[PDB]
Amino acid sequence: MTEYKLVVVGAGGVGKSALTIQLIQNHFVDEYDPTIEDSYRKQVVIDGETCLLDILDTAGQEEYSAMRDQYMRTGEGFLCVFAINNTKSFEDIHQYREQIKRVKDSDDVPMVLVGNKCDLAARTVESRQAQDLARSYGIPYIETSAKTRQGVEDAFYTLVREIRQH
């Protein structure tokens, strides 16, 4: 049935894997193991539609990013993740978005901006700053915590809702 190909991108350590694993497997990964390229598939009902999520969890560490752009080519929508306690990861978002536009050869690609680790109080990216970035892109901004589950389903389901607008 309806399949949605989602790709999760962003700087090393922002919580791409923890977010995906919380969504799919319902637990929090406390440790840090850098990703090369992993995929997950699960059947879910989203707004009354039974569908299949195929999620590519990509490397954020440059050293482990070989051929990432090839893996990403098939993505239908992209979760652009930064951490709210990592200003550099937020600044990097523009470069991830440019890479997405390159691999899709389009300036109109479904995406959602995600500010993760919202359970932490060492915030250096304020909500309004991320809202403004997302506005400039024509996409939603959503905050998440892979640790508490806050916003996790919402982030991924919102991306499906963006793909459906394409």
Residues at the contact surface with Ca ion, assessed by CB under 5 A: 28, 30, 102, 105
29-48 positions binding ligand GNP, by CB under 6 A: 29-32, 34-35
- Is residue 119 a contact residue for ligand GNP (CB under 6 A)? yes
State the binding partner of 66 from Ca ion, ligand GNP, Mg ion, none, CB within 5 to 8 A by kind: none
Instruction: Establish whether 127 is an annotated binding residue.
Output: no
Instruction: Tell me the pairing of strands 49-58 and 141-143.
Output: unpaired
Residue 117 burial class via C-beta count within 10 angstroms: exposed 0-12, middle 13-18, buried 19 and up = buried
How far is the C-alpha of 106 from the C-alpha of 77, rounded, in Å?
A: 12
Which residues sit at the interface with Mg ion, rule CB under 5 A?
16-17, 35
Output the six-digit token pair for 164. Answer: 């459906």
Cβ distance to Mg ion smaller for residue 27 or 166: 27
Residue selected from 9, 12, 156, 158 as contacting ligand GNP according to rule CB under 6 A: 12
- Please state, in angstroms and rounded to a whole number, the distance separating the CA atoms of residues 45 and 53: 10
